Design a protein around this nucleic acid. Structure first.
Ligand SMILES: [Mg+2]
Ligand SMILES: [Zn+2]
Lengths: 49, 277, 79, 1350, 49
DNA sequence: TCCGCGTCAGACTCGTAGGATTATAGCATACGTGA
DNA sequence: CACGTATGCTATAATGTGGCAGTCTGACGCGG
């Protein structure tokens, strides 16, 4: 996977609610990964590494 | 959520008192006279010193905690044999003891097979020599090249580098992923195959039948010598203990039994057939 | 038989019992050196027992009866 | 040694000491110089034993003379070295250490025992916090955690009179102090007073634990380790590699960790170290022991040399690779070989080509033996050297040994039992194994490099079991279906087809012959073709009423070739069998017929003869392939250019405004899909026939002898589908998403695909290939779950003498009968004297095997329904009766007692899955005249005049005159029927039309349409058009819906002109139709509807591909009893029902039975609509809701035969979709194993009480003795277990451990002190004993009676 | 054919002696399994007849 | 009861090839067994 | 005594740690 940004989305999967939860993943060549993601309640979350 | 043994212990150490110079002197005089609290406080206050050297002693043999514990053993001996009468500081003296005990433990527990520090120390000099040689000879040290530099025997250098060889894991597989483990390649050698074991059962069985085919006095001194029928494998002169009690007549009769048995193997169909074996 | 063992299954019935009975008889000829009722014709002990079962000479009950007889003859001799 | 059972229990510290022969104090392994064991080290000879046989370490005593002579100087016993594999040692731990398996393994025993959460215990163990063990002052009670600071407070204030401690000493004290008796009584008292539903389970589970703990005689203290056992040296060996290096087990590294830290702890205790440091060392000690027992469970596993985690004790037992699966449930084997396989067409069915050098080696001991009996070899070593020299006399002896000695051939994978077969070997020069063609089917053997294992049965018993049970000849019929597998194909079938097939006139048309011999003589003379149509005189031999054969002579109008084949045909068979053109399909029937009329030896000879003649005439012909063979339809481009301008016109109409992406996608796919069928049909009409043959004068039409057409029509190789992409049009290709490309591949393989057609092909191809690699493993995992569950099931009894029977009806789905009732009840014991229509004379008896003759009688009388005896309804405890099962389908007669049925069932369900790894249904048109029969149907009459159906379950049947059901037809919801109930229709009439795409929502009542809760953006969406402006409404579901609309159900509500609610005829229900996900309504609010109208179109996307990839998960879901998300509701008890309470819309259906005064009240969703209306006398298990049924609910209300039949049919639906024939009785076996356990209410004379789960057989045994003697009667209820749980619920823990979850199985067995008496097959295979089944059933039943006395 | 050590040699000798009799024993893999479970501190005993 | 980390699973034989790394100070006094 | 193996002692001050796992995935429980 080329370093850069990627915008992806669980197409359902989580929550039989069937909500599409969008996420950003910033992938460096070297370093910790920086994740942003949505929650079923439309709250923006960060996962460091 | 502090669950880790390490982070718990390092939390406990931080939570200690840090000592000064005059405080070290007061506690140390009480400590050598035999104070309970003085010993405990000097040890607990200087734990941080163990860790700083223990952190710079990892990735060699044991784990951080393992080195920290053995380093702590050095701290104890340091407090016992500390001299407060000498103006010179404790931290300097303790550093020696902590490094000593850690090094000694790393030389023992690491090597799977218990190795002597005497051979280990010799090895150290062989390796340091190799380093200096490698920097100037772009290649790596030969055993002979090292031996020439130390003015020592080639054989002795080879013996030492022969004890440096690390042990491989048998439980660990080799075939790319997990296809076969070293255990499953390597057979039990001390144990004979059933073909070999069955061959010995046939010779032993044949001997019993071969004993009731020669003379009664020719298989009474030939087998009681080799320990075939008897209990103890005797020699030409020791067959005299039984009833033979001769040296000449025993040697003539041993070989007379073997000569008639050699014709028994030439006729059955072995002799040169079973000579290769 | 030689090719197929269907006929010998039809005599005893249970394939499993056919095998036990043919085994027991083949063991007699293998060890005891019991003489075969049918001409050997260069046949292995496995096939001869199946011939004897096919023709209906060998059977669990028959084998048991003759075992008792030889065993009683030996008791007679010992006493 | 020979033992009865095995028991497992917690090890006492003192028990551990018993096994030990000394305490290993030091980590020292061996001396670097004298590589001998160190003092009191891990390989100490003083503890584990001597390194060399009968020799002490210091070397003072040698030889077998010295026996058990413990050398005084070094302290080493003079015995065999073998002892070092058996003797254990031990380690004295300074601090008590918790055993990870009882701590971490969920649920956990230490936690459940103390009723204390894991978190609390761990805080205690890692020395974060103190726990109170006991305080007389209620100030601090029991098990209350105190932090470092919490301990300082009470310590000043109370102190002393309250005991709180830290680490494993604390938990051990807490375990020692706890009284199992008293807590049992206290917990019983709590359940009496206030039994809360969910906490009754948990309290009853701790009660069971406490009871079981006391009965086992295990002590809770022992969960904590004071003494630690040491594994014998040879089981953790340090051996020298050839390179001079050593190699050792990781257990040595883990033991050395433990000893170093333990000894350091002893030191720091001797030195009175400050407690922070003592604590660290106690943590490190527990870490090391937990790593040694089970590394990786306690968090981060200890990495050794590479970085890989060290392999611990538990890792050697647990994994598939552990010791169970790898070294015990299967092994590497002596007298085993392998090589490439190759054909042996010359072989007879019972033979196989075995390479000389391979066989020399495999039969080495047998050669040695004959060599010594002939006196050619003086002894064994001379015999070995004669073999090494490969002397000429040795070959002659080897030939003599192999005679009549059967050899096992095996091919991976062994999916079913025929993957192993026995043959009589034929010594051959050359290195390849020669396999008989006809068995290649069972092995799935094709000679493009496959290999086979050879195994030599050594004992007389093993030879007999191979010759009788496992021989090729004797395994002709498959164990799954009655249809046989042994049948020739390819060249063999090609040659037979060529000869049989007759061409126009040819040489010597319409001659007359005396028998097949004149025919053979004519053909070989070259005066007649094999295909000449000439009459011959043949004499057939038909069997009479007895065993005597009747002879019949008559003139037959066949061909030369068929006459000559008659010569091969054994007497008994009709000439009509050879009189057709023969293919592989006809030849299989021929051999089956011959087997059932004549018997085994004749079919064996006949099979060989067919193979010989088939090859012989196969080489005499010489058909092949070319470039002109693949004929291309002349009118292909005419149908391509038409279809292509048509699709072009719709693409131009797309920019105009009549088209969405989905609509045009469907329209283009439909156009190309019809074009493809057209071109294929024209291609097949120019290939199958299109033979202008000038007959004796004028022209005729006959079947084409085009090579590829003959290959396809004969069924020799390719199918019509493969020829569709060969000379026809390649067709529409589907993307990896499953959505289909709009542009099809008009070009074929003959014409050559373009770069783009090839690239597009790749997707499907590679997904296929990846599917075989990846999906094979779920199929195989299902085989293995099935096998484990149905291992124990064995034929135990001949006749249980039960009348119970699973009523089996004819599978008539989709017009043409899918599976006939005759074939569904063929070879099954009948239940209840079932005669003919006229009840006045018995036709058939009771327990009577249904033979093909009985079945043929059944068809003349046209019996539809038959109660037959089934495995599920069999009363036999600990197995099943020969009669309940019926015929062994592999043998063709009644099953033998002792046969392992369960295994055969699991294998036969599993195999097809592992090996196997048109949506134009719009109108029902009826094939034969009759009257329309509509069962289960509620429809409303629309303004057209037409019957528009509004039932969900609708079954249209076609009744004849006499009144039998012959065709079925599933009518859907939203259907227009042409004719109503019980009306006459003629052959080829359309009786109902419906749209396949879109399930419409059809309203019963007439009036105006109201929008309830249909807020735009909240619940629906609005989409507007141009010039005037047509808006269309799409119902967004909760998936796309906002938080605001979540609670709102959107529904089209029917109001009248006044704007009052219209009622649904005759009920209190107001009309309201709840619109689901994406219900696309055209017509906007306030539009006058008539009844029977389409309100809303929910889109029905059918993107599913008819393959086992999608089918097998359904099969696994049925076998494992996976409850659905919307279970179907059913009536619990019978009685008369009215409605009570409602939560807004949610129905609380209240049943108030007639006799049984207690009510049964159910909460029901609002949107779920009921089939029943109000006051009806409904019985137990009447269907209330729409949706799929849970097998649990079926069993629980209707019962056994209901749920068994549900599983059988739902599974069989999948396999039948893929053309797989498995008999129901196999599925029935596994369902029986599913319904093994039962929950109990009340007590009997034993220890049942509330809700214990015990096996059904054992509670029936109790009930039999109870009913005779009396005592407290016990109500029971059978429970369904899905496969995985059912296998873990087996009362053998050796089978449970070998299956899965080994760590958890052994902790639960160890704590219960469970005793395995080795009843099952897996158990006996593990200990390496005789199986309790097949051959072993005789011996095993003799041991069970030896238990009664001596 | 696999583990049984005594059994394999004994049956080899029988096959050269032409006895074709098995004389089975206990697979060594199972003896190991027992030792490995006792090394875990679980008492697993064979219960006699 | 429900959101959620946790824990347990994922066809059968055949093959190929061997295998790694690091560094722990100089010296004297000391304890242990064989001659 | 002696070779191999082990324990010993040294003094500027120095006193809280830190290399990866790459998100497999459907499944089924056990605390808050
Ligand atoms: Mg093929
Ligand atoms: Zn000794």
């Amino acid at each position: 996977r080329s370093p850069g940004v990627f915008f992806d989305s669980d197409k359902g999967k989580t929550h039989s609610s069937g909500k599409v939860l969008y996420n950003a993943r910033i992938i460096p060549y070297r370093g910790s990964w920086l994740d942003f993601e949505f929650d079923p309640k439309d709250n923006l979350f960060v996962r460091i590494d | 959520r502090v669950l880790d043994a390490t982070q718990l212990y390092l939390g406990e150490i931080g939570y200690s008192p840090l000592l000064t110079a005059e405080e070290e002197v007061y506690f140390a005089r009480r400590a050598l006279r035999g104070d309970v609290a003085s010993r405990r406080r000097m040890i607990e206050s200087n734990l941080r010193l163990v860790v700083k050297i223990a952190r710079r002693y990892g990735n060699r043999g044991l784990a951080l905690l393992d080195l920290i514990e053995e380093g702590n053993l050095g701290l104890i001996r340091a407090v016992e044999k500390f001299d407060p009468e000498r103006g010179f500081r404790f931290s300097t003296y303790a550093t020696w003891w902590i490094r000593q005990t850690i090094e000694r433990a790393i030389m023992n527990q690491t090597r799977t097979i218990r190795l002597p520090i005497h051979i280990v120390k010799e090895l150290n000099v062989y390796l340091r020599t190799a380093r200096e040689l490698s920097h100037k000879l772009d290649h790596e040290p030969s055993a002979e090249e090292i031996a020439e530099q130390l003015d020592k025997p080639v054989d002795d250098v080879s013996r030492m580098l022969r004890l440096n060889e690390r042990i491989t894991s048998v439980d660990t597989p080799l075939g790319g992923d997990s296809e076969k483990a070293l255990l499953d390649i390597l057979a039990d050698e001390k144990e004979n195959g059933p073909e070999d074991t069955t061959q010995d059962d046939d010779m032993k069985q044949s001997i019993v039948k071969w004993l009731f085919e020669l003379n009664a006095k020719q298989r009474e001194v030939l087998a009681r010598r080799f320990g075939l029928l008897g209990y103890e494998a005797a020699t030409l002169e020791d067959v005299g203990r039984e009833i033979g009690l001769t040296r000449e007549r025993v040697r003539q009769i041993q070989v007379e039994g073997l000569r008639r048995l050699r014709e028994i193997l030439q006729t059955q169909g072995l002799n040169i057939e079973a000579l290769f074996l | 038989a030689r090719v197929t063992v269907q006929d010998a299954v039809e005599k005893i019935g249970n394939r499993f019992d056919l095998v036990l009975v043919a085994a027991r008889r083949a063991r007699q000829m293998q060890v005891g050196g019991k003489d075969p009722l049918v001409p050997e014709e260069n046949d292995k002990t496995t096939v001869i027992a199946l011939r004897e079962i096919e023709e209906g000479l060998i059977n669990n009950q028959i084998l048991d009866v003759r075992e008792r007889q030889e065993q009683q003859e030996q008791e007679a001799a010992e006493l | 040694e020979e033992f009865d059972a095995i028991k497992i229990a917690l090890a006492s510290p003192d028990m551990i000491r018993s096994w030990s022969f000394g305490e290993v104090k030091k980590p020292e392994t061996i001396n670097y110089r004298t590589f001998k064991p160190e003092r009191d080290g891990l390989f100490c000879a003083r503890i584990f034993g001597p390194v060399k046989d009968y020799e002490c370490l210091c070397g003072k005593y040698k030889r077998l003379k010295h026996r058990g002579v413990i050398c005084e100087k070094c302290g080493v016993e003079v015995t065999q070295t073998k002892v070092r594999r058996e003797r254990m040692g031990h380690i004295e731990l300074a601090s008590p250490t918790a055993h990870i398996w009882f701590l971490k393994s969920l649920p956990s025993r230490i936690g459940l025992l103390l009723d204390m959460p894991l978190r609390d215990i761990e805080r205690v163990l890692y020395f974060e916090s103190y726990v109170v063990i006991e305080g007389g002052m209620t100030n601090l009670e029991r098990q209350q955690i105190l932090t470092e600071e919490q301990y300082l407070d009470a310590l000043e204030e109370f102190g002393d009179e309250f005991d709180a401690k830290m680490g494993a000493e604390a938990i051990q004290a807490l375990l020692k102090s706890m009284d199992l008796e008293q807590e049992c009584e206290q917990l019983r008292e709590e359940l009496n007073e206030t039994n809360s539903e969910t906490k009754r389970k948990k309290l009853t589970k701790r009660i069971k634990l406490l009871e079981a703990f006391v009965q086992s005689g295990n002590k809770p203290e022992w969960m904590i380790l004071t003494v630690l056992p040491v594994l014998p040296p040879d089981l953790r060996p340090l051996v020298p590699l050839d390179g001079g290096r050593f190699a050792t087990s990781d257990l040595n590294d883990l033991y050395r960790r433990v000893i170093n830290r333990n000894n350091r702890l002893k030191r720091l205790l001797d030195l009175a170290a400050p407690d922070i440091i003592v604590r660290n060392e106690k943590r490190m000690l527990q870490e090391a022991v937990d790593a040694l027992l089970d590394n990786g469970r306690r968090g981060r596993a200890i990495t050794g040399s590479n970085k890989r985690p060290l392999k611990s004790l538990a890792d050697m037992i647990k994994g598939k690779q552990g010791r169970f699966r790898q070294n015990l449930l299967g092994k590497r084997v002596d007298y085993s070989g392998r090589s490439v396989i190759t054909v042996g067409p010359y072989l007879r069915l019972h033979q196989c080509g075995l390479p000389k050098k391979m066989a020399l080696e495999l039969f080495k001991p047998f050669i040695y033996g004959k060599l010594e009996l002939r006196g050619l070899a003086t002894t064994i070593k001379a015999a070995k050297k004669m073999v090494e020299r490969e002397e000429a006399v040795v070959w002659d002896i080897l030939d003599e040994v192999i005679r009549e000695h059967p050899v096992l051939l095996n091919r991976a994978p062994t999916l079913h039992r025929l993957g192993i077969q026995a043959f009589e070997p034929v010594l051959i020069e050359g290195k390849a194994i020669q396999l008989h063609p006809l068995v290649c089917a069972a092995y799935n053997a094709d000679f493009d490099g496959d290999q086979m294992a050879v195994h030599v049965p050594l004992t007389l018993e093993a030879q007999l079991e191979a010759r009788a049970l496992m021989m090729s000849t004797n395994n002709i019929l498959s164990p799954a279906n009655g249809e046989p597998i042994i049948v020739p194909s390819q060249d063999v079938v090609l040659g037979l087809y060529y000869m049989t097939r007759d061409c126009v006139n040819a040489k010597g048309e319409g001659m007359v012959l005396t028998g097949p011999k004149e025919a053979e003589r004519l053909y070989r003379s070259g005066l007649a073709s094999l295909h000449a149509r000439v009459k011959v005189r043949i004499t057939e031999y038909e069997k009479d009423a007895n065993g005597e054969l009747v002879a019949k002579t008559s003139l037959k109008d066949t061909t030369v070739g068929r006459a000559i084949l008659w010569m091969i045909v054994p007497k008994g068979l009709p000439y009509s069998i050879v009189n057709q053109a023969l293919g592989k399909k006809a030849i299989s029937k021929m051999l089956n017929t011959c087997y059932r009329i004549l018997g085994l030896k004749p079919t064996v000879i006949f099979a060989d003869q067919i193979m010989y003649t088939g090859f012989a005439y196969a080489a005499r012909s010489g058909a092949s392939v070319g470039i002109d063979d693949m004929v291309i339809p002349e009118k292909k481009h005419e149908i391509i250019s038409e279809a292509e301008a048509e699709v072009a016109e719709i693409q131009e109409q797309f920019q105009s405004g009549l088209v969405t992406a989905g609509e045009r996608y469907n329209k283009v796919i439909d156009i190309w899909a019809a074009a493809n069928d057209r071109v294929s049909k024209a291609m097949m009409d120019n290939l199958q026939t299109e033979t202008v043959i000038n007959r004796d004068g004028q022209e005729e039409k006959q079947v084409s002898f085009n090579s590829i057409y003959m290959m396809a029509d004969s069924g020799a190789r390719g199918s019509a589908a493969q020829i569709r992409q060969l000379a026809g049009m390649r067709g529409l290709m589907a993307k990896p998403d499953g959505s289909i490309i709009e542009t099809p591949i008009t070009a074929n393989f003959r014409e050559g695909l373009n770069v783009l057609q090839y690239f597009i092909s790749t997707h499907g191809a590679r997904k296929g290939l990846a599917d075989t690699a990846l999906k094979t493993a779920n199929s195989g995992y299902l085989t293995r779950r099935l096998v484990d569950v149905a291992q124990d099931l064995v034929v135990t009894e001949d006749d249980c003498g039960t009348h119970e029977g699973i009523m089996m009806t004819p599978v008539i789905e989709g017009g043409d009968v899918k599976e006939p009732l005759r074939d569904r009840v063929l070879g099954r014991v009948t239940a209840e004297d079932v005669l003919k229509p006229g009840t006045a004379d018995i036709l058939v008896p009771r327990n009577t095997l249904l033979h093909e003759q009985w079945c043929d009688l059944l068809e003349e009388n046209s019996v539809d329904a038959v109660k037959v005896r089934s495995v599920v309804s069999c009363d036999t405890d600990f197995g099943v009766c020969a009669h309940c099962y019926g015929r062994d389908l592999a043998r063709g007669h009644i099953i033998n007692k002792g046969e392992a049925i369960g295994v055969i069932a699991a294998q036969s369900i599993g195999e097809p899955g592992t090996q196997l790894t048109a949506a134009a249904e719009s109108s029902i048109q009826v094939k034969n005249k009759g009257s329309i029969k509509l069962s289960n149907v509620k429809s409303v009459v629309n303004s057209s005049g037409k019957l528009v159906i509004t039932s969900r379950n609708t079954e249209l049947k076609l009744i004849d005159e006499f009144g039998r059901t012959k065709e079925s037809y599933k009518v859907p919801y939203g259907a227009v029927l042409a004719k109503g109930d019980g009306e006459q229709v003629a052959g080829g009439e359309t009786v109902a039309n419906w749209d396949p795409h879109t399930m419409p929502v059809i309203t019963e009542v007439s009036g105006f349409v109201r929008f309830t809760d249909m807020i735009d953006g909240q619940t629906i969406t609005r989409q507007t058009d141009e010039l005037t402006g047509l808006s269309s409404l799409v119902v967004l579901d909760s998936a796309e819906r906002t938080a605001g609309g979540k609670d709102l159900r959107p529904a089209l509500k029917i109001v009248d002109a006044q704007g009052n609610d219209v009622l649904i005829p005759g009920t209190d229900m107001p009309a309201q139709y709840f619109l689901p996900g994406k219900a696309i309504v055209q017509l906007e609010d306030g539009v006058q509807i008539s009844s029977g109208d389409t309100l809303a179109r929910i889109p029905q996307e059918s993107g599913g591909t008819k393959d086992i990839t999608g089918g097998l998960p359904r099969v696994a879901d049925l076998f494992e009893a996976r409850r659905p998300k919307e279970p179907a509701i059913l009536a619990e008890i019978s009685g008369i029902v009215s409605f009570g309470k409602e939560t807004k819309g949610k129905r609380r259906l209240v049943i108030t039975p007639v006799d049984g005064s207690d009510p049964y009240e159910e909460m029901i969703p609002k949107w779920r609509q009921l089939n029943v209306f109000e006051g009806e006398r409904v019985e137990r298990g009447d269907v209330i809701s729409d949706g799929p049924e849970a097998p649990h609910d079926i069993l629980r209300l209707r019962g056994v035969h209901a749920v068994t039949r549900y599983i059988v049919n739902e599974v069989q639906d999948v396999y039948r979709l893929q053309g797989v024939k498995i008999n129901d009785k196999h599925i029935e076996v596994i369902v029986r194993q599913m319904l093994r356990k039962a929950t109990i209410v009340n007590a009997g004379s034993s220890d049942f009480l509330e809700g214990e789960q015990v096996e059904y057989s054992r509670v029936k045994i109790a009930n039999r003795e109870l009913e005779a003697n009396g005592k407290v009667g016990a109500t029971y209820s059978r429970d369904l277990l899905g496969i995985t749980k059912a296998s873990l619920a087996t009362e053998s823990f050796i089978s449970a451990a070998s299956f899965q979850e080994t760590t958890r199985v052994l902790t639960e067995a160890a704590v219960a002190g469970k005793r395995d008496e080795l009843r099952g097959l897996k158990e006996n295979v593990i200990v390496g004993r005789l199986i309790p089944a097949g051959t072993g059933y005789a011996y095993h039943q003799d041991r069970m009676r030896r238990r009664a006395a001596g | 054919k696999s583990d049984d050590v005594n059994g394999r040699t004994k049956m080899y000798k029988n096959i050269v002696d032409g006895n074709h009799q098995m004389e089975p024993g206990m697979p060594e893999s199972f003896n190991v399994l027992l030792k490995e479970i006792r090394s875990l501190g679980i008492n697993i005993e064979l219960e006699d007849e």
